[PDB]
Swiss-Prot record:
Shown residues in whole-protein numbering: 123 to 145 of 400
Name the record gives this protein: Large envelope protein
Applied value in biotechnology: Systematic vaccination of individuals at risk of exposure to the virus has been the main method of controlling the morbidity and mortality associated with hepatitis B. The first hepatitis B vaccine was manufactured by the purification and inactivation of HBsAg obtained from the plasma of chronic hepatitis B virus carriers. The vaccine is now produced by recombinant DNA techniques and expression of the S isoform in yeast cells. The pre-S region do not seem to induce strong enough antigenic response.
Post-translational modifications reported in the UniProt record: Isoform M is N-terminally acetylated by host at a ratio of 90%, and N-glycosylated by host at the pre-S2 region.
Gene behind the chain: S
Protein localization: Virion membrane
Coiled coil segments of this chain: none
This protein's domain notes: The large envelope protein is synthesized with the pre-S region at the cytosolic side of the endoplasmic reticulum and, hence will be within the virion after budding. Therefore the pre-S region is not N-glycosylated. Later a post-translational translocation of N-terminal pre-S and TM1 domains occur in about 50% of proteins at the virion surface. These molecules change their topology by an unknown mechanism, resulting in exposure of pre-S region at virion surface.
The family this protein is said to belong to: Belongs to the orthohepadnavirus major surface antigen family.
Role, per record: The large envelope protein exists in two topological conformations, one which is termed 'external' or Le-HBsAg and the other 'internal' or Li-HBsAg. In its external conformation the protein attaches the virus to cell receptors and thereby initiating infection. This interaction determines the species specificity and liver tropism. This attachment induces virion internalization predominantly through caveolin-mediated endocytosis. The large envelope protein also assures fusion between virion membrane and endosomal membrane. The middle envelope protein plays an important role in the budding of the virion. It is involved in the induction of budding in a nucleocapsid independent way. In this process the majority of envelope proteins bud to form subviral lipoprotein particles of 22 nm of diameter that do not contain a nucleocapsid.
Length: 23
């Protein structure tokens, strides 16, 4: 699961602070 990865972008739910919907 790429979600179990991104969990941790700096910590297990840094994820939600960090997918800007405009790449």
């Amino acid at each position: 699961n790429s979600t179990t990865f991104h969990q941790a972008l700096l910590d297990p739910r840094v994820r939600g602070l960090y997918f800007p919907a405009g790449g």
